[PDB]
Amino acid sequence: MANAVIGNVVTRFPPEPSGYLHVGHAKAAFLNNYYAQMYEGKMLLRFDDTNPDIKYEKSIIEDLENLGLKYEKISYSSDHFDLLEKYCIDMIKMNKAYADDTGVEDMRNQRGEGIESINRNNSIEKNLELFNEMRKGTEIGQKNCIRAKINMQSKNKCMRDPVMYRCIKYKCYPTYDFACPIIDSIEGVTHALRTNEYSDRIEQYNWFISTLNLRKVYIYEFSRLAFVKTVMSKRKLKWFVENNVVDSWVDPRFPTIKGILRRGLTKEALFQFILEQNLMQWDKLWSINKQIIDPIIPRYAAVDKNSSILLILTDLTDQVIQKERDLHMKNKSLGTCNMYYNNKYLIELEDAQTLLENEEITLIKLGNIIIKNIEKENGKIKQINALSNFHTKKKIHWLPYLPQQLITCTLYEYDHLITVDKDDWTNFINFNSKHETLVYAEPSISSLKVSDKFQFERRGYFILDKIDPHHHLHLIKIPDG
Ligand SMILES: Nc1ncnc2c1ncn2[C@@H]1O[C@H](COP(=O)(O)OP(=O)(O)O)[C@@H](O)[C@H]1O
Ligand SMILES: [Cl-]
Ligand SMILES: [Cl-]
Ligand SMILES: [Cl-]
Ligand SMILES: [Cl-]
Ligand SMILES: [Cl-]
DSSP: OTTOOTTOOEEEEOOOSSSOOBHHHHHHHHHHHHHHHHTTOEEEEEEOOSOOOOHHHHHHHHHHHHHTOOOSOEEEGGGGHHHHHHHHHHHHHTTSEEEEOOOHHHHHHHHHHTOOOGGGGOOHHHHHHHHHHHHHTOHHHHTOEEEEOSOTTOSSGGGSOOEEEEEOOOSEEEOHHHHHHHHHHHTTOSEEEEETTSOTTHHHHHHHHHHTTOOOOEEEEEOOOOBTTOOOOHHHHHHHHHTTSSSSTTOTTSOBHHHHHHTTOOHHHHHHHHHTOOOBOHHHHHHHHHHHHGGGSOEEOEEETTTOEEEEETTSOSOOEEEEEESSSSSTTSOEEEEEEOSEEEEOHHHHTTOOTTOEEEETTTEEEEEEEEEOOSSSOOEEEEEEOOOOOOEEOOEEOOTTTOEEEEEEEEOOSBSSOOOOOGGGBOSOOEEEEEEEEOGGGGGOOTTOEEEETTTEEEEEEEEOSSSOEEEEEEOOO
16 A cells, blocks of 8 residues: 555445446455555445446445445446546547547557557547537447547557547446546545456556546555356356346355355455455365354254154153253353253264164263164164163264254255356356255254354254244355365
């Protein structure tokens, strides 16, 4: 941040309302916030509608609210079109801008080979009256674009007469390249943050600023954020949606901020992952998210609904005993859930198959028990009979066989959308990347409210997405890196 001064820093986040925000957007928005906060500065939110819906502006304001960012003001590039017009005319009168009717292909490698276009020497007043043709929309006007008069022979291709105004309320619109430095300057930005993929652009940016004798804006570049096995092109994502491969932009497989928060990511983890680091691997982002959520979420129990095996404590009765226990043992201010138990339990079959005819084991948060026999009807295991011994390296989780109180849950597990890491690209999709499994979970889990994060013991981490009628829960699995 060159020549930054505490209390005199202004940054801005300038997304286009042409789609929903994704993770890379989140890096930009966050870094703008981080540099503004570092100097006790101000951060503007600019909707960049230079070359133009409102559903997107709404979605943006909600995603920013969700990331916890707050802005001093909201502006639209549109709001300065009249002024940009004025500046355009000024440049025409300084012989710094001219009207051009050379064709797009021709113009493209006239630029490539550095020959001055025909109109580069146009008189001032022809340039102005052509600009008027453009502002009215005449067939002349549409054949004409205004461009800056810089240097067709510069080693920097961005310095070779870039287009400033195009004919397309307004009949003519400024390009990004021209609108960005002017608007940044007059809005009071002091430090404009931009992806360093647009890096040849800087000399042009500053050119415009000095050529109009405007207050300089420093540029701070950063790397763009891209992930393996991920697509963030807006066209590829709408393709996913239109073929019902997903059925919403909020799908947990989508790198949108909405989708990624639904999937379990915490804003804290995303910000830390941005600070504490060719594509990136989701593994480290989800490992940070794990480290962050693990000590502040409760632990509940679940067993497979269908493969569950019945365990009997022969020496107890069918009187259900209740015991308050703590949700998370380590952080004892997280609260207490309730634990119900009696003589009949459900355990996993992957656990049932592991018990030998006289082992001692431990039902977590309850106590040790003594396995007595393994009744196996047909080939499978039908039932297990054990002994209370409440007063071992086989500690298993369990549910009390109380079906009118156990909560039924669908576990959604997701895989990457595409198969390669980065025209016949749809052959690299994973369509069967949404896995459902049904479980019973602990009665006390009815406490949870939608959006809550928790852990299923010896299963993994989950977020409660929706609650169906009849208290049926939908649980999205949070990857754990
Ligand atoms: N993948 C990305 N990673 C980081 N920052 C990005 C990424 N994509 C866009 N940005 C930044 O997001 C801001 C708004 O982007 P937007 O105008 O929507 O541009 P784009 O057309 O590149 O999506 C810009 O500052 C842009 O440089
Ligand atoms: Cl960086
Ligand atoms: Cl892509
Ligand atoms: Cl959905
Ligand atoms: Cl990064
Ligand atoms: Cl995968």
